[PDB]
C-alpha cells in the first residue's frame, strides 16, 4: 500500500478544498443528489416536525483528483477523509430544530477518473405542515427541501439521482405507511 501513500501525497500537495473542482471557473459543478430513507423515526404533530434517519448520496467529479492506475501499482479507487476535499454544502432548507447541514464527515470513495461518491448519514428534522382534520385517519404530505446554501445554479448544479427516494433499506414503521414518495 506504499502506492496509495505516494498517490495521496501527490493528489494533495497543491490541492485547495476552498476552490470549486473544475478546470475553468466559468464551468458548473454537476452534483448528483440522491436520498436514501433508512427510518421514519417520529412525526411530531404539535411542533410539526418529522425526524428521519437518511443517507445523502452525493456524486460529483473532481477535476484535480485524477491519476493513472498503472503509474501507482494498479490502484483504481481510494478512500479519503471528506474534510480534506471540496464538497457541496447541501442544507435542509426546511430544517425545524436539527442540523442544517451534514455533521458526520465520513470518508469519500474516490475513483481514478476523479469521480467522488460520498454517502454521509444524517438525522433530518424537517418542518412538515400537519393537517389534523382527519386525525387519527389523517394523511400527511412531508417534504425535505435540499439545496446548496451558498452556491447558486450558475456555479454548482444539483440533479436528482432517481425520480424517487431509495427505500430499499427502509425499516418498517409501527405508526405510518409510506404510500408515495418522489423527488422534484
Amino acid at each position: 500500500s506504499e502506492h496509495e501513500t505516494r498517490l495521496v501525497a501527490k493528489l494533495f500537495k497543491d490541492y485547495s478544498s476552498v476552490v470549486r473542482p473544475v478546470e475553468d471557473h466559468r464551468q458548473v459543478v454537476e452534483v448528483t443528489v440522491g436520498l436514501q430513507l433508512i427510518q421514519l423515526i417520529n412525526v411530531d404533530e404539535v411542533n410539526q416536525i418529522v425526524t428521519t434517519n437518511v443517507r445523502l448520496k452525493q456524486q460529483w467529479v473532481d477535476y484535480n483528483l485524477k491519476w493513472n492506475p498503472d503509474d501507482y501499482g494498479g490502484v483504481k479507487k481510494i478512500h479519503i477523509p471528506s474534510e480534506k476535499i471540496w464538497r457541496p454544502d447541501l442544507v435542509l432548507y426546511n430544517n425545524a430544530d436539527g442540523d442544517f447541514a451534514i455533521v458526520k464527515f465520513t470518508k469519500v470513495l474516490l475513483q481514478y477518473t476523479g469521480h467522488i461518491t460520498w454517502t454521509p448519514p444524517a438525522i433530518f428534522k424537517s418542518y412538515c405542515e400537519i393537517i389534523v382534520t382527519h386525525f387519527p385517519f389523517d394523511e400527511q404530505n412531508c417534504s425535505m427541501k435540499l439545496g446548496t446554501w451558498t452556491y447558486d445554479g450558475s456555479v454548482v448544479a444539483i440533479n436528482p439521482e432517481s425520480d424517487q427516494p431509495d427505500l430499499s433499506n427502509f425499516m418498517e414503521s409501527g405508526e405510518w405507511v409510506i404510500k408515495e414518495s418522489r423527488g422534484w
Binding site: 500500500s1 506504499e2 502506492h3 496509495e4 501513500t5 495521496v8 427510518q39 423515526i41 434517519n53 501499482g73 494498479g74 490502484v75 483504481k76 478512500h79 477523509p81 458526520k104 465520513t106 470518508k107 448519514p121 438525522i123 425499516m171 418498517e172 409501527g174
Partner: protein, 227 residues
C-alpha cells in the same frame, strides 16, 4: 534509553494510517471480532430503543507494525493511541441516535508479529422494533448490526474470535461473574452471524456485516403486582 521509544520510532516514522495493511490492492484484511456485553441498560418501548454497554474486541494483522522482541530488549507489547494506526472503522449501523462509533478511543495493543488488538468500550442506542402483541408477557429480538463504514467486503472481511479451546465465539460474550441482570429484561439467547450479500454482477462490490440477535425476555412482575 527506553526501548519503547526506539520501537515506537521504528514502527511509526514511516507509517500511513490512511492506507489498509495490504501489500496488493486486491488483497483483503481479515478482522476477528468479538462483542462483549457488560450491561443491558434499558429497552425504551416508547422510542423503541435498546441501550447497552459493551466493549468490542477487534484483532487483525498489520505487516508494517511487525517487530521481534529480541531486537527491542524483549518488548512483547506496545500500547499506542488508536489514532496513529489504521483502523477498520467498525460502526453500529442500526443505531437510532446518530452515534455510530465507540464511546472511548482506547489504546491499541501492538504485539510482536504484526498483530494489532483494539478493545474500545461503547454505549450503543440501537433500533429495536417492539412486538407489542403479548406485552407485558413478551419477548423481543433486538439486533446489533456491525459493519465497516468505509470498506467493502473485498477490502475488509470479518470472522468471529475463538476461545482458548479454539471454539468459535459466534455469540455475544458475557462475563458471568461481573454480570448484573437488567431489572426487567433477561437475556435468553445471543447468537451472531456473519452475512455477505450484494455480490451480484449488477450490484457490483460485495458487502458484509455481523448481526447479533439478543433474544430477551421481560420479567413481568411489576405489571402483575401493580396493574
Amino acid at each position: 534509553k527506553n526501548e519503547e521509544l526506539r520501537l515506537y520510532h521504528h514502527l511509526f516514522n514511516n507509517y500511513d494510517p490512511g492506507s489498509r495493511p495490504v501489500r496488493e490492492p486486491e488483497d483483503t484484511v481479515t478482522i476477528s471480532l468479538k462483542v462483549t456485553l457488560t450491561n443491558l441498560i434499558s429497552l425504551n418501548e416508547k422510542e423503541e430503543t435498546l441501550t447497552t454497554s459493551v466493549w468490542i474486541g477487534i484483532d487483525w494483522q498489520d505487516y508494517r507494525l511487525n517487530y521481534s522482541k529480541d531486537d527491542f530488549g524483549g518488548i512483547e507489547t506496545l500500547r499506542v493511541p488508536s489514532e496513529l494506526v489504521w483502523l477498520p472503522e467498525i460502526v453500529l449501523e442500526n443505531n437510532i441516535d446518530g452515534q455510530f462509533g465507540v464511546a472511548y478511543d482506547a489504546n491499541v495493543l501492538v504485539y510482536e508479529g504484526g498483530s494489532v488488538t483494539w478493545l474500545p468500550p461503547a454505549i450503543y442506542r440501537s433500533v429495536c422494533a417492539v412486538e407489542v402483541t403479548y406485552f407485558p408477557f413478551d419477548w423481543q429480538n433486538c439486533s446489533l448490526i456491525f459493519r465497516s463504514q468505509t470498506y467493502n467486503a473485498e477490502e475488509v472481511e470479518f470472522t468471529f474470535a475463538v476461545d482458548n479451546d479454539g471454539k468459535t465465539i459466534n455469540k455475544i460474550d458475557i462475563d458471568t461473574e461481573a454480570y448484573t441482570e437488567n431489572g426487567e429484561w433477561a437475556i435468553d439467547f445471543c447468537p451472531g452471524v456473519i452475512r455477505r450479500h450484494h455480490g451480484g454482477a449488477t450490484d457490483g462490490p460485495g458487502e458484509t456485516d455481523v448481526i447479533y440477535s439478543l433474544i430477551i425476555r421481560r420479567k413481568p412482575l411489576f405489571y402483575v403486582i401493580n396493574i
